[PDB]
């Protein structure tokens, strides 16, 4: 089977988290506890394809963006998170995009805009703009929610996609 590492970033407490063990165990986690680094190597299906995930979820405190050098030349596959009720984090989706970017060289990594916390009645950031980013870089564009479940294997799964359309490009 195939490889995949998937690399989770984002500003903390946007649900990188949340979403990942939402993946994994079909459980939403409703304490706070802002991880150092996580590790997950999950087998699923993807279009009839078995995939083996290397699932990376990162530390969105700013006193580990020390960290993010090694992880990033590494991963193969982005998911920038947001949280649809936090500004600050779509802005921060900019810089760890530009991170990436330099860390690998390269105009196109496969990446995927993630929107989570889409179950809130408290939005700051519209679709428009979200849709508008993602659109400017070029990615799809996922509205998620760790407490529903809403979108969670659909942004996996299409960052995967992404990975295997850009290997049988390369
Ligand atoms: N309503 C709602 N709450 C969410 C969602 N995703 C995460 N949360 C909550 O937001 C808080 C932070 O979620 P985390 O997954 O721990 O955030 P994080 O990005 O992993 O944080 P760091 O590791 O510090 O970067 C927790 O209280 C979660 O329950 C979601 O989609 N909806
Ligand atoms: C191999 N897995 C058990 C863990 C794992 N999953 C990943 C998914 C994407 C990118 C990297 C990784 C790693 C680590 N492998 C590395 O080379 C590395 C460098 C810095 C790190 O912070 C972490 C890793
Ligand atoms: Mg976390």
Known sequence: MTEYKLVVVGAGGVGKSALTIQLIQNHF????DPTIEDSYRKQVVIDGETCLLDILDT???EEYSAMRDQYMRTGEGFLCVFAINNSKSFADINLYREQIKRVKD????PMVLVG???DLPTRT???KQAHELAK???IPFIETSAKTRQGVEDAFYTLVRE???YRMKK
């Open 163 to 165: 990975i295997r359309q």
């Open 125 to 127: 950031v519209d679709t």
């Open 29 to 32: 986690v409703d304490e706070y």
């Open 136 to 138: 400017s870089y070029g």
């Open 106 to 109: 390269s105009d196109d990594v």
């Open 59 to 61: 530390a969105g405190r």
């Open 116 to 118: 989570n916390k889409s």
